[PDB]
Each structure stands twice: as C-alpha cells, then as structure tokens.
Amino acid sequence: DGVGSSSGNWHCDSQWLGDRVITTSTRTWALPTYNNHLYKQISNSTSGGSSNDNAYFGYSTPWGYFDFNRFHCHFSPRDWQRLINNNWGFRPKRLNFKLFNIQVKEVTDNNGVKTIANNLTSTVQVFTDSDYQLPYVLGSAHEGCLPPFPADVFMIPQYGYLTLNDGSQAVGRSSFYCLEYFPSQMLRTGNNFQFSYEFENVPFHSSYAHSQSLDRLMNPLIDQYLYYLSKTINGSGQNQQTLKFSVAGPSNMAVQGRNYIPGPSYRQQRVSTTVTQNNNSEFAWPGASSWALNGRNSLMNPGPAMASHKEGEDRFFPLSGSLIFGKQGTGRDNVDADKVMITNEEEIKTTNPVATESYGQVATNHQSAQAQAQTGWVQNQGILPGMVWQDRDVYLQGPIWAKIPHTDGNFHPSPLMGGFGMKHPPPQILIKNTPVPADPPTAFNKDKLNSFITQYSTGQVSVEIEWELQKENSKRWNPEIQYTSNYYKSNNVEFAVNTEGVYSEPRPIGTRYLTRNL
Amino acid sequence: AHSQSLDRLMNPLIDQYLYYLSKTINGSGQNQQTLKFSVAGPSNMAVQGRNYIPGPSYRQQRVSTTVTQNNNSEFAWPGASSWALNGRNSLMNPGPAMASHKEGEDRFFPLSGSLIFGKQGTGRDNVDADKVMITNEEEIKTTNPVATESYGQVATNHQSAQAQAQTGWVQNQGILPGMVWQDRDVYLQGPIWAKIPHTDGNFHPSP
Amino acid sequence: AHSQSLDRLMNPLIDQYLYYLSKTINGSGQNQQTLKFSVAGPSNMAVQGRNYIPGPSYRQQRVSTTVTQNNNSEFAWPGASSWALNGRNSLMNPGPAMASHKE
Amino acid sequence: DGVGSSSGNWHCDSQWLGDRVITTSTRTWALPTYNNHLYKQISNSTSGGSSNDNAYFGYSTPWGYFDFNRFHCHFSPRDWQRLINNNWGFRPKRLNFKLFNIQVKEVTDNNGVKTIANNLTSTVQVFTDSDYQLPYVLGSAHEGCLPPFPADVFMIPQYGYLTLNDGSQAVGRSSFYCLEYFPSQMLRTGNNFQFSYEFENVPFHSSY
Amino acid sequence: DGVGSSSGNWHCDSQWLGDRVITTSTRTWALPTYNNHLYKQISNSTSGGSSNDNAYFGYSTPWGYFDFNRFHCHFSPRDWQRLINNNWGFRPKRLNFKLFNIQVKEVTDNNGVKTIANNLTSTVQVFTDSDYQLPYVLGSAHEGCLPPFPADVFMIPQYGYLTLNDGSQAVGRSSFYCLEYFPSQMLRTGNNFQFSYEFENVPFHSSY
C-alpha cells in the first residue's frame, strides 16, 4: 500500500497431497513500451512481400500478454518425474495468478550514457480477458512463456493478433479490436493484481502407454466361432473356383473378427534422420502433407495423433507430424539436425496407426470371373464407427491448453499439438505501461502527443495451478517402465546449469511411461 | 430393420424448392455451354437435397457362394482388406457394420466382413462351404452402404473449358458430419459384450 | 461468420518452439541428402503446428455461372457426386456443409 | 492517499442495459503552465490589426478547461453504430467526472539537455464551475476535446474568454473575471478529484 | 511498514539470570550480487587442474547464507570469562533470528566515478531452510561468520555446495538443488524478517 513495502512474498513451492499436486511458480518480468504506444497494422507487404500462403493482415498492439502455457513453467523436472512415474493421468483444476512488487523505472538518454532513474508515480495497467472478447494468441505454441529456471528474468511478449485478409488487404468485416476499450486496472509502485480462475471440466489426460497391441486384444488359446473365407482357388486348374471357409484361431491371429479398429490416419512423408537414405531432391515443402483453406495451402504440423514409426525403426519420423522442440542455444534459421530435438511417438503405436504408413488396403472392383480383385491403398481415412484412438502426448516443453474455436461443430477437440482442449481456457493477462507525455508545448496543438518518456516496468509474477491427479492401481508383476536419469559421469548434470549459467534441457520428457492394459 | 430406405425418406407428391443443376451442354454445338437449373422433385427422386447421408464404409472384396463366378486365382488373404498396426497386417474381420449385399443378390457376401459361424459337427481346418453358416446383413441395406460396393464418386479436378470433369471412386470413407448408420446385428450364436479398450479416444464403441 | 480463418488462429509476432523439417537436399550435388530443421514462425505461417484441422469434405464438381467456361459436353448427372444405397445411385444434394467457393 | 499508490483504476468500458447505455471513457492528459501564470489580455491589434468584423477583446487566463463535448469522446464507432442502427433517439442523463493518478513533473533546462525530474510536493488545482459564473467556452465547437482513440495522449486546452469590445478597446462594463477568485481544490501527487452532475430534462434527440 | 521508519532497534545486550544466559548480538551486513545471478558449477579442472584428492564437483549459487556459528559472534570476551570461570557446562536452548533495516542501494558506473544512489523499490529475499532439504554448509568451520567486534561491518558469504564426483565429472545421481525452488519471503526497504528456532536436547558440554 506504499512505496516502502512489498506487495507480495516470492512464492515458488510445489506441494503434494493425496491426489492433488499444487505447483506454484514465480519469475521476474521486464516489460518495455512496445510500438511507442501505437496500434500499427502489419501486412506481409509491410514485412516484405511474400508468397500467397504467407499472407497475413493484423495489428500489433502495444500490450504484452503473460504467457504461462508451456509445462516447464510450473513443473520442475524432478516434479515432472514424480508426476509421470507415478500417475496414470492428470488435469488442471484452477489457478491463482498474482502480480506484485511492480517497479516502474525511467530510462533517460539525454546524457551520453543512459541512466535508469526510478519513477515512483508512473502507472502500469493490467486486465484479464475474462470474456475472451479478444482473439486468443496463447495456446498456439508461441515462445515467450514463463522461463523454466526460476532464477532468470524474462521479457514480456508483445500482443498482436491476425484477422481476415485478402492477399495483403483486409476484407471489410476484419474487426479491429482496441485494447484501451477493455476495463483495465491501473497499478502504482506499491499496488498488486490478482485473479482466481477455475478450469473447465477437461477430461483426464492419458499418461500411460498401452501394454496390449490393439490387434492382439484376444487370448491365444481359444479360437472364436467366426469363420473366414480361406481358399478360393482350391488348386491350379483352369476352372477350379470353390469357397473353403476355415475357423479363425490363434494359429492365424491376423484375419479374425475384431470389435474395434485403429484410429484415424493422415499419411505423412517418410524422412530419415540418417541423411544418406533421404532423397537427393528437395522435398521439404513440396512433398509434405497440407490442408487447403480459402485457397491457401498450410502445412499440417502435426495432424491427428499418430505413431511416429513402426517398431524397430527409430531413425524415421514423419516429415511434419511431430513436435520438434529446439535445444538450448539453438539458432533460428537453418539449424542442423543434431541441435534440434525431435519427439518420437512410439508410445501409441499400439492403438493409433503408423504416421508414415498407408492405413490399409480397400478393394475397389468386383472379384468377378473375368476381372481380378484389386486393392488400392487408403492414404487418409476419416473416423469410422467403432474406431478408437489415443491423443497426442504432452511434453515437459509442450503446451497445456488451447482455446477451442467457437464454431458450431467440432469433433474431439483435443488440440493437435497435445494438451487440453477447453471452451473457456485461462484468460489472457495483458499489461502495458501507461504513457506519460514528456513536455507538451506551451501553446495548444489539436494533435495527439508524440513525445513520451522512455520507460519500462519490472516486478514479479505468480501462477498457482492445482492439478487433479489420478493414481494408478495396476497388477503388473514385472517392474513397470519408469523414467530415470542415467547414472553416468558427464560434464554437466542433466536439467541443470553449466559453467556459463545457461539452463539446458537435454531431452524432451514425454508423459507416457506407465502401462495400462486395453 | 428400417422400413424406409434412407434415400427415399421424402414424400413423392411435393417437390422441394431446392433447385439443382440439370443441363450444361444445352445441345450439340461446339461452343454451347449454358447452366440450366430445374426443380428437384419426385419425377427425379435421386438428385435432390437430403439432410442425412449413409454411414461409413470400408470396401470389401466380392466373393460369391456360387463357386463358378469366383476368380480362379487364389485371393483369400492377398485380396482381402486389412488394417496395418505396428507394421503387421491383420485382417479386418468384420469391420464397421455394412450391408452384405445389395437387393436381389443373395449369393454374394463380403470376403472378411461378416460373422461366419460353424454348424454343429463342423471340422476345424478346410471345411467346405455347405458345412459353415454365413450371416447376411441385408437387414440394414437401407441405412448403411453396401459392403461390396464403392461408397460413391467424388469429383477430383475442375470442370474447366479445357479439362473434362473427372470422378474417382471412394473405396473407404471415414465418418462425416450429418452421417447416420446402424450397427451390426447380434445373433443367437453371437456375443453379448466386449471390454472397450481403456484408451483416451474412441468413437461409438459398439464392438 | 467467423472473423478468424482457422489456419490463421495464431498471433504473428511470436514463433512457436515446434520445429519443422525444412531442407532435405542442401544443394545440388548427386549425393547431398541432409536434414535441416528450422523454427516455425510468422515468417512462414503455413507450415507450423496447429491444434485443429478443417472439417470434413466431399469433392463437388466445379460449375461456373458464366456459361462460357463450363465444359461443352453434358455433365449434369454423369459428372455429379452421388452416394449409392441399395444399388441405386442418388444425388448428394447438398452434402455436408462446405464452402461454395474460395475467396 | 500516498505517493506510492494509484488514485483510481483506468476505466473505459461501455455497458448496455435495457434502455440505458453507459459510456465511460478515459484519456491521459498533459497540462503545461500557460501564459507563465499571468492573466494577459488579447485584442485584435495585439494579435495583428484586422478588419472590424474580426475584432475581439478578451483575457487569456492560465487555466485549462477539460473538454469532452464532441461525441467521439464517449462512443467508440461500433458503439455509435449500435446506437444509430437500433434507436429512435437518445438523451444524456448524468455524468461522473473523475481525475486521478496526478503526476507533477519538473522540467529543468539548466543543463544543456532538459531533464524531466519528478516533483512530489507540487500541487495542481482544479474546480468545477458549478454556478456557471464564468463565461462558457465549451459548446462553441472548439478543438481540444477528449481524443477519440483512447491509447493517445492529449494536451489540455487553454481557457480564454471574450467580453464586450469597441474595435480593439473595451467598454467600461467589460467585466474581467479572475479564476483565483473561485474556491478551487488543490490536488497533490496522490489525491484525486470527482464531481457528479445530473443533466437537465433535455428532450429526446431525433434519430430517424 | 514504510521507507521513513526503522524495522527494528539495534539490540546487543547480554543478560544474565539464575541459570540461563541470554546473549543477543547484532552486526551490519552488506550483501552483493554473486555470480551475476547465475548458478554456475565449479569443478577442480575449472578452478585449475589438481590432484585426485583435491577433486570436487559442485554448484556456486548466487545466495549468501548468514553464518553465526563461531562462539565469538555471541560472547563478548568478558562474558566468555564469566561463563568459563563459573560454570561446569552450558548448552544452547533457543535462538531468535531477526533481520531488519534493509537498505537496497544501486551502484551505477555509467559515469566515470561510481555513484551509490538509493533504490527504494528493489527487493531482497530471504528464507530459512526449515526442513534441511539443502546441503548443510555451516558447521564445517567456514569463515564469514558474524564478526566479533560489533562496531564493524561484515560481508555475507556465498552459498556453494558440493555433490558426488568422479574426478572432475559428476555421477548421474549428483542432485542439483535450485534455491529459487524454496518458498522465499521478499523484503522491501521497510520490511523485516524473523524466525524463532528451538534447539534440540543436546547434552551439556563439558567445561571442567
């Protein structure tokens, strides 16, 4: 309530209860003044003329949103280990966002060297997007989330949305949202801000790799009465055409009545990490699989949850069907293969089909006396009755939520990049420094002022997401697979800082390590 | 068994206002290309606005109980329809509920898309056709598609002034919005229940 | 009518950590086959991780109101898209909700 | 109540009810010191000799008035669309003027480059003209109203009235109002000011 | 509770009772920012290659621990004389740690000569290690304890632990503790921190 006190206590503990884990977090933000307090618009021609596919018309507001979407914002790697090695699933229940210890510094470059003088009276304003009236930018896997290692300082991102476009031009129904319009709360040097949100009833996330291949769901000792056609040419004669049935049994496990069939598929190109086997010709974009909307092709990235590779072929991976995180200290453009982290989806090869394999043959013509039966592969297969499948994994570096588009008809709105799909995700938290004009002229001027005091702000942030957590009771006898840290000498402990002090996450941690039978 | 074929859900006395494209070449001239619409009605019941469409499909080979018509070459396994999981092909047996045969063709049946029970005192391996019981699914030919017939054509290219419109058949068709279908029959010799696999996402888990 | 194209649901200022395969032939050599990833970002909006994908489809013939561009040959019934039930073809009319034309 | 707190929350929402629309607004002002704190008089000869028609005798007080007369101060264009497309008429009923988060900076040009150092103790004073004793300058379509787009900063106008004149000279009944005379309220770095006004029973404006 | 007040009174008396001696103490600390707020690791090769015996792998956290382990922190030599000349033994029962009058200065070397300008809004954070989850570095006879003569100013030490090692390399079970993880309490210019601890039933120390 005053400039000589703190508005909150740094809180960063991670409690554990019988079936709920509360994971508080806190980082030190530093928000500059974006776009010099102007609502510029951005188009592809403005940012350099590009192809029709990479066309976008949108505005770049001066506000910055607080991003705490990625998992590693909340879960320290040990806590993530405790959550993946011991639980069949988890889901978030509520959060408690706090923002305190606001400092508003003023940077003056009037002298030769800038001096960061404090500014007690200046105000920085925040507001939740409680009704989701603005476009949603979280959940689209945008960098700038809360940094993983608490002892570092992160810069607040910048909030710029996109609307309808026609090339570089805007259709007249391209609504332009103004952020000053929303009722914002102004915060001084000693104020603080807090809102409590309750998560929607999102279903439990799967955290178990199935230990029973779907096409092996049956016991191998008793043969079902469902016969099956076995022979059609009972020999080699010119006119030998009979119909010999036979009982389907464990001797021939493949062809036999199965209640359920594997999930949907969308064929993806086969690209191998061993650079020798890949085709010499360039096939990054031209060979990939894309869906066309409004006449502009856009890459799948990553499509419905599928299996990265069949058993025993680790070197492969779908071209654009797997999340590919970047290692610490990795460049932006044209980074070699070894400096980028590829996530394989071999945990759900049991149920879902193989991402780089045709779903299966379907007979086209008629097995007539004059035309041989013909089978054409199914490259893509929409969902069918009786079809079961498992959604994509979430990784410690992966996202949590994503706002389901507010459309009439959607099917299984689990976001494709992995996570939880909610109609009302946790709202955005937009923050901007209230502009303070420097020295207006002593004569009137019917014009908006264009000389502001160069300033920024800094403080803390706190997020307390409480996760529901479903314990496991399985009668697996042999030791179930669990995630562990290799006990081999190395120059650096994994998930810990090196000599320079940069926090490096060496590998992505999927949350499918336990087992649960079909 | 539904007593009203899905593509005949409409009364045959009143024609709906939904027009439909009827003629494109209004004659035989080299450069005669017009667009003549016409009202869809009971005179032409086929092409007319329909709210709902028949259920999913997975094309199955056409094998006939009359042993003469079947192809001489062996096609039991190589010609059948299978789904690949973990790199090992496995026969469908019997796939989503479909219609064993169109009206009037009882001798046919999908190769591996119908429960085939065994009669009393039937051997295990290489049993002739007459000693094994085949279940036909002609009870749901109204709603579900025909198991041994392509779901339907879909236009691929553009009906341009230089390229003729082309239609390629749909061998397999995942479910679409507005699609209705009927599940498989249960028989006195058939099963009752089946444990739904404990996976995150399944659709209509009727075994 | 939705004012946000589904393939443009993301903000154009921050690039997601989801990489994507970018180059396979890193030049023009006979035996040059590498795997160069790159970060997906607003510079290349198309190929990038998207949670949701557009709805179902059933390809329909392209017929133009300008009578000149349409094919000379008759294609009203023979070229249309129909679903077969009980062995009798019947026209779609109008099929699942789709977009009549691109922008 | 202190220099380490805010005197108000930025409020700019525009609610809608069954038959009343409440249109709050907010902008960031920046008021300099006019006329070096002197009550100069202005005449046409002072501002360059002109014709008889363009003759005026008046004083240019150092005070600045808050102008929120133009419509676009309150109604965002979408809100104006909702009000013209759906209503036969409208009339204002009451307002609630607030003024908060006062900062009083001090600009010193003693150095070569001016440095805007903060000034905690300085006071800026406001007062409503509740009895309309001063000449009325709003409502004559003068620029300087609240700017339309909220995210910009506007400069407070300057208050200078006009009285009776004869050419460039003043008839002896040309009353000279002094603004120090009115009971003003002084505001420090952490104070705030607020007055609630009720509109007269003005008839409905035609919107058809 | 404000920047214009003190958060505690300098207390340094040493009372004496029938059979309990209470020895309060107080010194003026001065804590810099260590390792530029980074969690570097340190190995013998990093600090110059040495023999196998002098091998160590550990991290040098930016936190500083308060050390009051040595006796002369508490007992003035006269008090120590009164305690050794008259008592067969002693043992500690409880302590009451206080930390007040926090000042957070900002050193700027932008000019040629550094100027130590005060910084009212900055925060310095403390927390007790109540559950002993971190490695224990006190009690190993490390310098930097509270200085003996009260009228001097001591610099807070730096907290860096050691874990398992193999030469200069770390076995995979070499847990790396991060100090941001513990629930810390943030203190402004006018706040203060205090925790009361009770000593275990340690047996009487021989003094004979």
Topology:
This is part of a larger assembly, with five copies of chain A.
Chain A: E1 14-16, E2 20-31, E3 40-43, E4 57-60, E5 64-65, H1 77-84, E6 87-99, E7 105-108, E8 115-118, E9 124-128, E10 153-155, E11 185-187, E12 193-198, E13 205-206, E14 208-209, E15 227-231, E16 244-247, E17 265-266, E18 270-272, E19 290-293, E20 296-299, E21 316-318, E22 324-326, E23 340-342, E24 360-363, E25 375-378, E26 380-381, E27 387-389, E28 401-403, E29 420-422, E30 429-433, E31 457-458, E32 461-471, E33 514-515
Parallel strand pairs in A: 2-10, 14-33, 28-29
Antiparallel strand pairs in A: 1-2, 2-31, 2-32, 3-4, 5-30, 6-12, 6-13, 6-32, 7-8, 9-11, 9-30, 15-16, 17-26, 18-21, 19-20, 22-23, 24-25
Strand content of chain A: 25-35%
> Class of chain A, according to the CATH hierarchy?
Mainly Beta
Please state the oligomeric state of the protein chains shown. Answer: part of a larger assembly
What is the number of helical segments of chain A per DSSP (H or I, 4+ residues)?
1
Total E-strand runs of chain A: 33
Distance between the termini of chain A: 58 Å
Instruction: Give the C-alpha Rg of chain A.
Output: 28 Å
Describe the biggest sheet of chain A?
8 strands, mixed
CATH topology of chain A: Empty Capsid Viral Protein 2
**How many domains make up the coordinates of chain A?**
1
CATH superfamily of chain A: Parvovirus coat protein VP1/VP2
Overall helicity of chain A:
under 10%
Structural category of chain A: mainly beta
CATH architecture label name of chain A: Beta Complex
Keywords (chain A): Calcium, Capsid protein, Metal-binding, T=1 icosahedral capsid protein, Virion
Main location (chain A): virion
Subcellular location (chain A): Virion
Family (chain A): Belongs to the parvoviridae capsid protein family.
